[PDB]
Each structure stands twice: as structure tokens, then as C-alpha cells.
Design a binder for this molecule. Structure first.
Ligand code: FES
Ligand code: FES
Ligand code: FES
Ligand code: FE2
Ligand code: FE2
Ligand code: FE2
Lengths: 433, 183, 433, 183, 183, 433
């Protein structure tokens, strides 16, 4: 049994150590489903996935199937995809438009709000229908992005995100028209723990700066160039959130990282001219020189990761300690030229899908990692998260918050420390910021 | 409960010589891939290739038009001659970790259905496949689907070039960690 | 450890609430194998499966493989298909005829009674062979059906069945000639808990009277008819056993779904003419108008389920909390005309095989229920089993026992209540009728 | 050990043209099924179709005669034209839950062996298949087996009607929850 | 990178008649194995048969030449006519427990590529297979690979004998508990 | 929790009784990885698998992936195949030659000794590299063979082996040239517990002298000979090691087993002429008449098994309670004539690969035993291990140590006894010889 005391010693943000059991242990996993996924704000998608009355997306929150649906009044509701009669899936397609939801088992009927509104033979066989609809999550939107949380006593989304909002805004707050999701959402399965993924996007530019993406970079540079000519970016910064375990890292004034991935047309869009100027002007309140932020990774804890310049967005659905599903999609400015939208669509497919020249190599790592952790000794010694220890500060004249060097495990040490908190403190009264 | 298909007459059957030629082409193409002869394989692809594998979704019958991703949507692949080239550079690279060590694939090709187009020496071909991928110690990925090709007679080794390929894969969620293979 | 107090909390027949954990929890399942399957009477097949000396069938009791074998003295023996030397499977084919069994591993030899009669090199390496033959099960027969029970302390079969016997007799006791199984036993695997299967056949006409079988009914009616012309019945009753988790439900006077499932030649055979009148006379001692009972489902707790007018029988083999095997066969009166037997055979394949136009939709439901239970919030609230609460009476003029309406969950509550009792009362002194 | 087949002469070889026609027939049939063109697929069934899939069992070699269910036994399928029609009615129904949303299948056909019968334009055909069925999110069911058909030349789209089909499936216990698909 | 294959001429295409003949030989061979006519199948083997299935391993690209086991190494099979005979004697034996009760297999053959050798009536053939093996209650073992045969025309029932067979399995570690089937 | 008291009662060597749970329990298995595999000497291969500097083999110790690499100083190091930064596999190929090893995730670099010698961006981001290399194992050699052990307080290899060494020498110490591994290491997967495999090679000549290998023998005998002529070897002996769980059994004087398995040329090389008399002379200090020892099996506990006259060697990698991997190779005397090496190669393929005429039948038994243990009653009573109970003596004129009859379970009882001791004695102070 995992005591608060036992859980606190899985991480040590002082010495920079992690117990490898955190990624393999079944007991700890069941706890996460209650203590982490049960009460966290989890990303479900985007307002554009469900623009019209009755439009719906069937997605997950941990291992709980949920339906995200647009109401007549324009609000979004999120309710468990489970009939409380005998557990049947109420909504049985991936996405679409509904006037109602009917259970296929015994035909209990629901409206688009998840209210139980008809029970066949109710008169003859029966109880208050208004007390027997699917559990409802709280629904909260950040500039397009739809989040949801089961927990009534959890912090509101804005309070949850807190000072991470400027970094999300780099991607989400660049035009008066907002972003929109490009159609389609990719789904695939990697046999690894979710934390490898959520961390990597939280804190890890290191892998892209070293050996992991040597071949993906090669795929994006011109045919006349080989890897020895490649510009190795070393300039940039890393943000650890004040509360929540959120994290973002980015390159500064080194476009070669962004050029190879997203190509000249997008790299220009992001950094020079009307759009990029407008964006820096809109992000003025932050004082951030966003035209100089050329390649960024971010994670809103637990499982909302994205790559602000390439605008690849992803949810990690946990599937035990040993597996995840990755659900990916991509964002564009609603008023970006059709040229730039198309550049975003192509290059996201090229780099970040299941077949992508970057993605192939990220998941190759995580699979072998998870495989080693089946070993006894493989779990007996702690892992090294000591990169950039006590090097971050909130003074930074360019980027707000706890900021350090781009190769650092501070954002990681924060995420894991926040993971540990949620897993050892049962009451939101001690846990809230 | 009839369909508009009823008013169409079936295509001219491909002759035996041509049926065989196109079967043989795919068999030799599968050999290229299964032997990891990637540069040789990339040489089959026409400069104007569009190589496209759309997403496939679970839809109610009355929403079947929505089953596959669209023209402007994300896809698993949506490639051109130039973007395929970068993929070849990655898969043949010493530091391409996903395929170094290389995976072990088999492309079993069958159900080859050939149609002559309005353009002589250009053919629309529909074929089925099972692609068996075995990786590292114990990983096994099995894919099934159909390929819709536009093939042109060409003076390469195999006698044809691939002008278009669309891969309709029998999956929604991909059960594999990646698509590090070619279809 | 699941305490008796905690197990007693899992089912509430007063309020009619079911804890979804019952279907998902691995620990409860391990306990089921001991407390339920280890001491219940379990269906193995029919006497006609093993008609002659030495005829055997390899089947299961829970996850224990067993051999059911016909003896020279015409009795039936049931022993564990496991060699007590090192555990090898003694009988290695599905069925057939044996003069003896011999273990493939080291050649221990058995007679057809499961008695160890030879150990190769006994004099050189040895021990009483009479003490080292495979564990024997108790064997008992109710009107052709072969049941077995490991537990020497359990109530005998007739006592265990109790007032459930009249409802079994509607199918099993219609002629002096008895029933016979059609040759063949179909086997398939469904990713769901056994209790969903057993509950449905026990209590759930509701799913057939509402949404699940709209398309199976559609497949059954005249080509000239559409669904809006089909007569889906509303009249009937549900039985809950005085003791033991047993239950049955049936339509009264409403042949529509019997006609659609079994066609007009079976429907007429079952309701009118010589054979039907004989059936009513034979069951005269029960007082039941069996000719008006047209479409019925039954479960004998835990895992013996059948459909009397259609004569489909199922054994649910449990394979963890998340899986079952279905072993299905069909029974016919041994003296039914060749014509009727053939309609029974034809229509059972059409409706109830793995490919059956009814069966496809039964399992479709269960697969999706079970996947959902992987979720934390999906197990966090009770399921509704409140249908027909308080509406059941014992003194019905036509049907004996505790009787209610056809769309009800009284039989369901009884089944889950007895499951609960079996799981929490370790001794037959308190558990027996 | 010798077998009575030794006194039999090999059956006469099907010519190139007839071989290709029958292959193409099956590929077009598989297309229909894989694209869920059920009404169109049903049109290929002769009115006197016996569509049979016996149970298959584990037996010792000395009891090999008992491997398959018999004439008068249960089966996974044992269908006439009429009962197949109800099955078409169900699979194309908005309220047929097992196949709404529909599955995604691939019938990969090969190993086509053709015997002309004593009646001209009627053929006995033996073929092998793998049927890959992917359903909803992550469900994969793989089948393999052989089909033994009688096909007659017919005046339909594809040029052949299915008079008899028996499917011998390489399974005892069916590893799938249903057979909502057609073989 | 350019490769030495660039200086080779493509092989002389097998004529349609020869293609069909060899494809039909493989289909009939598959049927024999799938129906457990082991003795009849053994009759297909030339007296000079070398039947070989090398080990296959994960190697970095730079050690590609070490992928498969060598002439003097262990292998999965490495058989002569005499040793194969013994295997035939075991599989047909009532006391051959691995195959009594027998398994249920499907040998799906495609991608048949035929090369005529210097010696007339001797052919090099490269084909692809999927082997689906189902055993007892619930065991399924799926193999994929290619077969590199040398076939000679023969005066047996099938018209060819198998003079050499090398099986290149798409596996490193065998995912099956045995190879009690033939390839 | 499994108390030491509970574990002690799982094996009874006095009565010769075994609790079947030992092969199925998930808790025991996890305990095994710690108490058994975490501190045993496990076989990794032969010295000839890594003949030159930098030569490596990626293999396992339990479920811990390890690298075994030849050093410049001609020593052999074995270290965990896991990077301590974030858990990545360091050596990603099966075998070959390395100048160094580099991790693909972030690029930490190692020498062929497993010392961490480079960290990308070490100055800008950071810690002693000499403390962040993968875990090292003790490495010791016995006459060609390479064993490894994580536990620094365990008995040295020679001590651990003890009086089992003569029986190993029958195979390993027949010429000054020593053995060499034929190239190639076959790997396959069996759904069974490792203990069935270890025990069989430890103690079970019985299975082969009875029913398991009747057809394997039939495969190997002359075509003009049927099984009734085949010879029934019954004459031989069995050794239980003084300490460790090791065991061996062999036939004396009866060469029917050997001849059918290995043919007439290997048989003659092993029993007649110059090499046979040299082998017997070399093992003179044992007193063992090795030329008479014709067909032999052995296990060095836990999972190092082999077959002296056929020279087949196996490592069993545990993969949970219900599965193993079999990694197999063969040994020949380095100076054996080419004729003989080739016969060893052929017959090892023919008999002992995954397609082996012997091996097919060994795994057939184990698959079914393990399946049966899913059953509750299958695990409810002990298995019989009473063969030759109280018949082994320690003073045999021909063979040293505790020696009994060829058909016995004395070595087996010893194997299970030492297994219980490792599982229930946390301290080498008590456990050591
Ligand atoms: S499960 Fe939804 S109505 Fe019964
Ligand atoms: S296991 Fe049955 S004789 Fe040994
Ligand atoms: S995992 Fe090895 S360097 Fe990061
Ligand atoms: Fe990456
Ligand atoms: Fe039903
Ligand atoms: Fe053996």
C-alpha cells in the first residue's frame, strides 16, 4: 500500500532523482486514475470540432469515455459515455451531429445535454429520470481549447493554468479571429507510460537538440545539404510554472530548427511581417518578443501537450502503466492565408503523424524504455533529472515566470513534483495554489 | 433498394498480358520494400506523385460520407515527390533510430483489379494487401487495406512508374506505434 | 481483502443498486472461482452428448478443464482434466470415445472412470495409485441435462434448483421420450463479464422488447413486411427463484417474436395440436398454461442459460472479469417430427450462432459495457436495477413462485443477491435453502 | 501408407482465360463486401445457394472423420437464399447495432484452383482467404480458411453467380465475438 | 547512394503459361499441407532437396551482412530428403503429440516471381506467404515471409518437384512455441 | 504478503509434494525476480560468442536486458542495458562489435566497459559521470560458459556450482582446446513457467523414457525400423547437487537414445576411440566412466540447462509466471573433426530447434499444464514429486555425490527445495553453502 510518505519519496526535486517505478507500477497507476486524471483539467479538443448545435465528439478522460457536445445556447457540455442502467455506450460513433442520444441496449433516451428524458415502459415497469443521467464534467475553454474536469472542488481553469497562459497565448492569442482546428484527428497506440510523453513536451528540447531527431532534421533540410551543415541551435529558454507542473521550452533567434520542420513560408509567417507584428502587439501585455521564439514545446499537466510554432496539439490517453493512445490534431489562425494553412497541414503530416519523420523516433525511444522497466534491477536505481538545478529565476526581461536554459530538467522536476503532490494530498484545500 | 451503379456498364476487362504485367510490377515493388531497397523503390515514383493515406473514422451509416478525412484535413500521409525524398533520406540514415535496426516487413499483394484509362499506357489499379511488420525482438504490426494507384508505362527497371497512390487502411486508431514503413 | 461487510455492500436488492466493480475487479473474480464456480452446480452438456460407454466430452467448470465421461454402469463421471503428477491434460481432444486415457507427458494411465491404473516404472521408482487420480466432481442429471459440482457439502441438484424446476420443465419435460441435443456445440469468445450474460437470460426480456433486436426481428419477418408492422409483445411475466439466483421471463399470448425468431412451423408445434396438448398435460401438476408461453429466457445460477421456446442452451465459461467463452447447443424433443427438428436446427443457427441475427447484437452491447468499466468514473456510481421493485407477488393464479411483469429486474436482483450471498457466506450451513 | 487418390488422374487444368475470369470475379466480389455494397453482393447469390460453414473440432488423428459438424448438426452458417436475404436486411439496417457503425474488412483472396464440372459453364472452385476485420476503436479479428464454391456463368455485372459456398475456417473456438461479416 | 544493381539488366519475364503453371503448383502444394496430406506433399520433394530456414537477427545497418545465420551456423530448419522423411514419419504418428490433435493451417501464397535458369525446365521462384496456424482451443500463430525455391519439371501429379527451398521468415525471436508446420 | 512461513510450505521435499501455485502466482513471480534471479548466477552464453575486443551480446538476466561485452584486457563485463538519464536501451542490436555505446534518446556516451564518458551539454547544463553509468554485474567463467550475478554477497561461481562440476565437465572439459559455440542463437516463446523447463532438464529423463518422445525417436531411427524395435533405455542414474538446486541424469551403457538422436558418427565419437578415451582420461579425477554415460540432461539452477552428449544448451528467460523465452545454442569440442561438428549442427537443428522433433513435444506438454493452472481446483491440491523418494545414496562407486536411479525426482525435489530457500532466506549468511 502506497502511503503519502512512500509517494513523496518517488521523486526528489532536491537531488534531481526519479524512481523508475512511477512508470511501471500498477498500484500507482490505479491511483493516478483517481488522484490525477480524476480531478485534473484534461484537454478534449477545440471549439471548432463542435461548432453547431448538436455537434459532438466522442473522446476520453483517462479511461473514461466522454461525449463533448455543443448545446443550443452555445455552451459545451461534457458527460460520461455510459448509460447508468447497465453501462452501455450511449454515443457510438467518433463524431457527428445529434438531435438526441438513445442507448442501444434498453433504449433509454437522452437529449443533447445528457439529461435522461425517456425510459421505455417507465409507467408499467417503474425512480426519477432527472437523477439517473450520465455524470457531468465541468467544461472550461481557453481561447478555443476545450478542457474538462470531473471535480467540483478543483481550481477553475484560469487558476489552474495560471502563469502558463502567456506561453499558450504564443500559439492561441495571435489574431482577433482566433485559431481553428484543421479537420481530422489522428489516433495511434504507443506502449509506454504517459509521463514520458507529457514530460518530453514539458521540458525536453534536449532530445531534439542531441541525437533523437538527427534524421528528421535531415528529412527537412534541402537535398543539397547534409547534417554537418545543419545549424545546431543552442540558444533558448525553459519555463517552469509556479503551480501545476506545466512547462514550456523554446529556441531564441535560431530559426534553423523551425525552418527544417515547418519550411520557409511558415517560418516567415511566424517571425516577420503583418501577422507576426500583430501577434507581438497582441502579446504586448506579456512584454514577450514572440517573433524571436522560433520553436517551442509545451505541456499543460497532465496530458495536454503542444508545439507552439508548428501548432501540433496532442492528448495522451493513459492505457495502464505500459501504454498510451496519442490523439493529435493541428491548429491554424482562422484568418491565416490559405497558403499558410496548407503549409501547416502538410508539414504536420510530414513530421508529426504516426508516419512522421520526427514522431517515428520519439516513440521508438519510449517503447524500449517501457520494455526495460519490466526488469527488477531496471527499477532498483533512480533516474537522473539533475539538468539546470537552481539556475532558473523570475527576473527575465524577455519571458515572465521561472525561466532558465533550454537544455534543463526544471520544468520536468516541476511536473514530477506536481504529479507527486496530487498523488499524496487527498484534499484540494492543501493542494490548490 | 437500388443504386445508381445500376446504370453503368462494367469496364473493359484488362487483357491477360497486361494483368500479369501489373501483378508482376507490384510483386517486384513489394520485393524492393521488403529487401529495404529504398532508393530503388523511390525511383518508381513519378515526379507528380500524390501519395495519400487518409484517416478513417467510425460513423453511423447515415453519416457514411464522413468516414474518411477530406481534401483539406489531416491524414496519415499526404506526400509529394519532394516530401517522399526526405522520408527516404531518413529511412536510409544511420541515425534513423526507428529503422536502425531495420524492421522486417512482408507486403502480400493480391486482388489486383486493372482499368485502362482514357490515356493510353496509363492505368487505374485497385489492389488489396496485408502488410506484416515485425520489429526488434517481439513487436508485430499487421496492416490490411486497399491501394488505388495510377500507374504509367515507364522506362525504368520494372516498366511502370507510380503517378498516384491512395492507401485505404482497415483501421481507425492505428494499432502500431508508428508508420515507419511504405505502403 | 474483501470483507463480508464490503462484499455485502456490492449489491443492494432493497434499493436496487449494483456496484459496477462486480464486473471488473480482478480480486472479486478470483474469489468467484472459489466461492461461486467452486461450489455451484454447473452445466456441462446433455446425456445425448455421451450416449455410449466411454463417450467423453472435454468441457469446463469455471477455468478448470474437466472430462465428462459415460461409464459402463450407465452413470456419468466428471473429473479434472489434469494429471496429478505434473498437471498435464489427460484428455486432449474435444470429444469422442475412449477405452482409457493416458497422459502424454510421462504415461500415467487411467481407466474411463478417471482412476489411475498404471504408473510406468512404479516398482523401480516407488505411494498408492488409488489416492492419486484426478479430482472428481459430483455429477447429477435434471431431465437430460448434465450438471456437476465439486463441493461435497453443497445441496443436491433438485434442492439447488427448487421452484425453478417448473420453468425448466416447459422446455425439458414435454414428452415421455425426453429431449436430445442436436449434434454440434458452437464456441466463441466475448470480451465481457459472465454476469452480463447470465443476468440477461435470467431477467432481461426488456432488451428484446425495446432496442437491441429491432434488426433481428426485421431479418425474421416476411420480406413484404417492415418493422412498423411488427408486433413486439408487451404481455408476460418474470419469475425469481425462492432460492439460488435463478430466474425466467416469458411472453403470454403474444406470438410475434416467437413467430419472427422460429417461424410458423415451430410456433404452431409449440402452441397447438397433439404435442403441445401433451406438454400442457405433462406440466399439469405445475398448473401452468404452457401453450400460452411463447418466447422465454432462463438462467440457472451461475452460468446455465437457455431459451425454452427456441431451445437454445448456453454455458458461459468465465475467462477473467473481462472475458467469457460461449458454448451453445440446441435441444429438440426426441420424438419431434424430422421437419420440426430441422426448423429448430435451421433457426438456431440463423438467430443464435456467433453469426446469428440476434446474437450479433447481444454481444455488441456487452463488449462496449466492459470496455467502459476500465474507467475510474465508470465504476464510481451504482447501476440502476430498480425495475419492478416491490411489484412481485408469490400467489399468481397461473405461474408458480415469486412472479412479476415480463419487463422487470426482480429476477436480476435475486441473481445478484445470491451471488452476494455465495461470495460472503463461506459455509453451507448458512447458505443452503 | 498409400491412399486411394493414387488411382485418380489429376483434374484437367483450367485455361488462362477462365483462370483470370474467376480470379477477377472473386476480387470484384471482395470489393463489394469490403465497400459494404451488400445489396449488390446479394445479387451474386443464385436462388438455390447453400451457404454453409461447419463447426470444426479438435480430434485425434484416429477420429479425423469427426473433425467437422455434419449434415444434420449445428453450424456457424447454413443458409438458403431466403435466410441470406434477412441477413442482408439486418446488416443494411440503421438499427442493426453490430454493423452500425460498420466494421472495416479486407478479403484477401488467393490460391484459386478451378475445376470445370460435367456441366459446361458451371465450375467448382477452391480458394484461400484471409479476412481482416477491424471494428470500432481497436478491435481486430483475423480469419483464415478456404472456400469451396460452385459458380455458374451468369448474366450479371461480374459474369458469375454463386450456386454453392462452403467455408472451412481455420478455427475450432471462434476467437471473435461475432461473425457480422460475410465470407 | 548508387548500387551495383544499376548495371544489371532486368530478368527475362516468365511467359503467362509458365507463370500460371508454377502458381497453380504452389496452390496445390498449399492445399496438400493445409489438408494434412503429408505423404503426398513429401512426394513433391526432390531427393536432392536442401530445405533451409536461417536465423534472422537485429543488426545495425552498418552490420547488415550479419542479419541471417550462415552456412555453418544453427538454423530453424536445415534439412535433407532423409531428415525431412523422419519429420514426415513424426507428424503422421499417432504418438506425435504436437500434431495429434493436428493444428489447422492456411498457406496463403502470392507474389510469385519466376526466373528461368540456364538449365531448361529448372526455375528459380520467389514467392511471398502468410501462414496462419490455429491450434487446439485458442492458439493462433501467424507467420509471414518469402520462399526462394528451385523447381524442376517432374512427372509427378503436380508437374514440378522442389529441388531447393529457403524460407526467409519475418521474425527474429519466434513468437510461436514451435514450428510443427511445414513451409 | 507471502510470509517466509507460507513460502516454506509451498514445497515439501520430505513427502515429495509441490504446491501448484508456484507456477502461477504473480506475487511469487515478482518475488522470484528479486530473490531468485536478482542474486543467482545466470548463463549469458559462451566466451566464443564475444571473441574480440568490443564484441557484444545483448541478452537477459531475468527480465533485465544486459550487454555482455569483451574488453581490451580480455575480461568480460556485463552491465544493465539501460541508460540512467531516462531509461533508454544503450545497445540496440542483438550482437556485433562496438567501439563505444551511445544512447539514442539524449546522446549520453559510454565506452565498451559501460562507463559514462560523455554528456552532451555537460558544462552548460550541469554530478559525477562515474556515478551515472549503467549497473554492473559480477562476471565469472566456467570452462567456456559465461555466468553473471548482480549480488556482491553471493557465493563465487565455483562454490555455487559445488559438486555439480563433474557432470558439467562431461560436456565442457573433454579436450585441452575446450568447447566452442557453433554460430547462431535460436530464440522462441513458450506460454509456460520457467520451472517446468528447469526441472525437466534437472531431473526428468522419465518423460523421454516413457511417452513424450516416442515420435521423436521414430523420426531418428532407421526407416526400415518401427518403434517396437527401437531400444527402451531403462539403465542409468541421477545426481542431486549437494547445494544449489542443480541436477543431472544420464543413461549408462544403453546407446539407443543417443544413436537415434545424434546418429552413428556422434555416438562413436562420444564412446569409442581417441577422443572418447581422452575425455575419460581428462575426467579421471572424478572416477567417472564417461564413455558409458550415453544421453544426459542437466540444469544449473535456476535457468541454465543442457544436454551433454548432444551438446544442446539453453537459457530460459522468465517472462511472467505464464511465459518464457527459450534461447538455445550448441557446443562442440574446438578440435572435433569437421565431420563431427557438422553432425552436431544438423542433429541439434533436427531435434532441438523450435521445429525440433523432440522440442515440438516438450512444449506441447508445458503449454497445456500452464493453461490448466488457470483453474482454481487445478491449483487446490499438490503435485506428485515422490519418485525414488529415499533411494538416492551418497557413495556410488561410479558417480560422485547424492546418486539415485535414472527415473527419479530426487534432483527435482532438490531444485524445488533450493528454490524455496532462496525465496524464504533473505540473507546469504543463512543461504550460502
Ligand atoms: S444499458 Fe442503457 S438502457 Fe440499459
Ligand atoms: S504429468 Fe501426467 S504423467 Fe507426468
Ligand atoms: S535516456 Fe539515455 S541519454 Fe537520455
Ligand atoms: Fe521529438
Ligand atoms: Fe438478446
Ligand atoms: Fe524432452
Amino acid at each position: 500500500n502506497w502511503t503519502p510518505e512512500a509517494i513523496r519519496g518517488l521523486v526528489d526535486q532536491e537531488k534531481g532523482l526519479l524512481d523508475p517505478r512511477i512508470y511501471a507500477d500498477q498500484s500507482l497507476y490505479e491511483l493516478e486514475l483517481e488522484r490525477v486524471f480524476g480531478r485534473s483539467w484534461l484537454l478534449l479538443g477545440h471549439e471548432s470540432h463542435v461548432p453547431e448545435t448538436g455537434d459532438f465528439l466522442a473522446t476520453y478522460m483517462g479511461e473514461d469515455p466522454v461525449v463533448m457536445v455543443r448545446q443550443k445556447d452555445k455552451s459545451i457540455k461534457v458527460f460520461l459515455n455510459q448509460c447508468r442502467h447497465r453501462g452501455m455506450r450511449i454515443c457510438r460513433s467518433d463524431a457527428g451531429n445529434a438531435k438526441a442520444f438513445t442507448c442501444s441496449y434498453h433504449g433509454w433516451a437522452y437529449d443533447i445535454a445528457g439529461k435522461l428524458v425517456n425510459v421505455p415502459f417507465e409507467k408499467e415497469a417503474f425512480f426519477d429520470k432527472a437523477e439517473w443521467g450520465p455524470l457531468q464534467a465541468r467544461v472550461a475553454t481557453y481561447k478555443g481549447l476545450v478542457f474538462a474536469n470531473w471535480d467540483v472542488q478543483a481550481p477553475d481553469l484560469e487558476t489552474y493554468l495560471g502563469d502558463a497562459r502567456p506561453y499558450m497565448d504564443v500559439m492561441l492569442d495571435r489574431t482577433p479571429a482566433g485559431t481553428v482546428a484543421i479537420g481530422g484527428m489522428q489516433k495511434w497506440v504507443i506502449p509506454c507510460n504517459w509521463k514520458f510523453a507529457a514530460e518530453q513536451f514539458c521540458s525536453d528540447m534536449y532530445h531534439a537538440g542531441t541525437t533523437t531527431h538527427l534524421s528528421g532534421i535531415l528529412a527537412g533540410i534541402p537535398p543539397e545539404m547534409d547534417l554537418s551543415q545543419a545549424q545546431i541551435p543552442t540558444k533558448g529558454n525553459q519555463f517552469r510554472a509556479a503551480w501545476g507542473g506545466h512547462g514550456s521550452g523554446w529556441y531564441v533567434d535560431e530559426p534553423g530548427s523551425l525552418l527544417a520542420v515547418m519550411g520557409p513560408k511558415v517560418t516567415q509567417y511566424w517571425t516577420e511581417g503583418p501577422a507576426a507584428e500583430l501577434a507581438e502587439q497582441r502579446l504586448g501585455h506579456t512584454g514577450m518578443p514572440v517573433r524571436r521564439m522560433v520553436g517551442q514545446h509545451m505541456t499543460i499537466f497532465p496530458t495536454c501537450s503542444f508545439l507552439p510554432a508548428m501548432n501540433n496539439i496532442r492528448i495522451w490517453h493513459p492505457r495502464g502503466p505500459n501504454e498510451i493512445e496519442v490523439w493529435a490534431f493541428t491548429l491554424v489562425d482562422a484568418d491565416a492565408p490559405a497558403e499558410i494553412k496548407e503549409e501547416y497541414r502538410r508539414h504536420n503530416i510530414r513530421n508529426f503523424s504516426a508516419g512522421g519523420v520526427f514522431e517515428q523516433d520519439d516513440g521508438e525511444n519510449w517503447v524500449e524504455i517501457q520494455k526495460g522497466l519490466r526488469g527488477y534491477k531496471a527499477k532498483s536505481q533512480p533516474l537522473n533529472a539533475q539538468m539546470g538545478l537552481g539556475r532558473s529565476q523570475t527576473g527575465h526581461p524577455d519571458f515572465p515566470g521561472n525561466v532558465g536554459y533550454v537544455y534543463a530538467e526544471e520544468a520536468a522536476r516541476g511536473m514530477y513534483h506536481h504529479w507527486m503532490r496530487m498523488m499524496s494530498e487527498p484534499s484540494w484545500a492543501t493542494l490548490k495554489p | 433498394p437500388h443504386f445508381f451503379k445500376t446504370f453503368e456498364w462494367p469496364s473493359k476487362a484488362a487483357g491477360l498480358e497486361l494483368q500479369n504485367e501489373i501483378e508482376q510490377f507490384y510483386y517486384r515493388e513489394a520485393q524492393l520494400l521488403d529487401h529495404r531497397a529504398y532508393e530503388a523503390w523511390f525511383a518508381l515514383l513519378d515526379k507528380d506523385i500524390h501519395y495519400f493515406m487518409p484517416l478513417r473514422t467510425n460513423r453511423m451509416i447515415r453519416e457514411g460520407e464522413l468516414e474518411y478525412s477530406g481534401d483539406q484535413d489531416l491524414a496519415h500521409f499526404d506526400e509529394t515527390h519532394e516530401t517522399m525524398y526526405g522520408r527516404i533520406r531518413k529511412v536510409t540514415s544511420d541515425v534513423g533510430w526507428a529503422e536502425n535496426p531495420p524492421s522486417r516487413t512482408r507486403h502480400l499483394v493480391s486482388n489486383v483489379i486493372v482499368k485502362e484509362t482514357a490515356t493510353p499506357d496509363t492505368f487505374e489499379v485497385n489492389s488489396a494487401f496485408i502488410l506484416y511488420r515485425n520489429r526488434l525482438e517481439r513487436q508485430v504490426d499487421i496492416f490490411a487495406g486497399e491501394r488505388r494507384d495510377v500507374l504509367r508505362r515507364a522506362d525504368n527497371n520494372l516498366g511502370f512508374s507510380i503517378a498516384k497512390r491512395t492507401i485505404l487502411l482497415d483501421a481507425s486508431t492505428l494499432l502500431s506505434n508508428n508508420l515507419s514503413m511504405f505502403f
